[PDB]
Amino acid sequence: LEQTEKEIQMLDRLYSLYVAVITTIKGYGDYFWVDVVEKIDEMGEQVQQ
């Protein structure tokens, strides 16, 4: 069988991309009052996001 291969990829690749998008948002979200309140890492948020 060959069709279900492409059928699987066409959805799975970009669903993986969009969960990876969630990954960075949550990774930054863990950052503290120390990490966020500081103006030296607020610039980090625009950089990373």
Curated annotation (Swiss-Prot):
It comes from the Eukaryota. Residues 35-49 form a coiled coil. It is found in: Cell projection, Cilium, Flagellum; Cytoplasm, Cytoskeleton, Flagellum axoneme. Belongs to the dynein heavy chain family. Force generating protein of eukaryotic cilia and flagella. Produces force towards the minus ends of microtubules. Dynein has ATPase activity; the force-producing power stroke is thought to occur on release of ADP. Dynein heavy chains probably consist of an N-terminal stem (which binds cargo and interacts with other dynein components), and the head or motor domain. The motor contains six tandemly-linked AAA domains in the head, which form a ring. A stalk-like structure (formed by two of the coiled coil domains) protrudes between AAA 4 and AAA 5 and terminates in a microtubule-binding site. A seventh domain may also contribute to this ring; it is not clear whether the N-terminus or the C-terminus forms this extra domain. Consists of at least 3 heavy chains (alpha, beta and gamma), 2 intermediate chains and 8 light chains. This is Dynein gamma chain, flagellar outer arm. The lineage of its organism: Eukaryota, Viridiplantae, Chlorophyta, core chlorophytes, Chlorophyceae. The gene is ODA2. The chain holds residues 1241 to 1289 of 4485 of the full protein.
